[PDB]
Amino acid sequence: KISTSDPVRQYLHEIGQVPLLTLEEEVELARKVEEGMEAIKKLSEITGLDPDLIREVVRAKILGSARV
Amino acid sequence: LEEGAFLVLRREDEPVATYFLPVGMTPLVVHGEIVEKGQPLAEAKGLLRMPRQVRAAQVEAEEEGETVYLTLFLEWTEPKDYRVQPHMNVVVPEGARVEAGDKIV
Numbered sequence: 001k002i003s004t005s006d007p008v009r010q011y012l013h014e015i016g017q018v019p020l021l022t023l024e025e026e027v028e029l030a031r032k033v034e035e036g037m038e039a040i041k042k043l044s045e046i047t048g049l050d051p052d053l054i055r056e057v058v059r060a061k062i063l064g065s066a067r068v
Numbered sequence: 069l070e071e072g073a074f075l076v077l078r079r080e081d082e083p084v085a086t087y088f089l090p091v092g093m094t095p096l097v098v099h100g101e102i103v104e105k106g107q108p109l110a111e112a113k114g115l116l117r118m119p120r121q122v123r124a125a126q127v128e129a130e131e132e133g134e135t136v137y138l139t140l141f142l143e144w145t146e147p148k149d150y151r152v153q154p155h156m157n158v159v160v161p162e163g164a165r166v167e168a169g170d171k172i173v
Contacts (some may be wrong), residue, residue, distance in 0.1 A: 023154030031157075 069144075072119040075108060088142065104105040121145050 022027045036058070044051045059068050072168065073089035077100075089095060089167060092108040100107040117154050118124060122144035129136045 027155065 069119055070121070071117070072122070088120055090116040119144070 006055055018025075020029075040054045040058070043049070043054050047054070056068060060066055071091045073091075073095050075085070075087050075089060075094065075095070076083055087108065089110055091111040092115050093112060099109060102172055122142060124140055124142070126141040128139045149162065150173075158173060160166070160172055
């Protein structure tokens, strides 16, 4: 049906399911992200591989499966 | 204690005595030293139970007469709390020991 309200009840559903705990979860995830950032950089060091490369391999693994 | 009584006596300062009382012992605050006259006049009647949080293991006894002197292990757990802010991290799981140099949060 009319996609006015579709991607709204799309968005507000998982934002309904996850409207971030203003500090707690909000930062919880930010930290995790930086953790990834550096993990990735040191992995570049250990493997001799590209930072954005490792980045994308991770990304591909998480999303389940993708062309990317 | 909740259920128990620690009795210590520093003549001058050195901990001259350290004698504990299981519940069922009747204490008397500042008595005793008329001639050291075995006057921690604590009565032992019936059950002498233990504080449930602090544990009693390691037994020793030097046997003589009507009473034996006993020396044991006394490990009472002190409940002491802390409060986590938004920006605090809980590196430790759901119950584990920690060293003197083993940061927690």
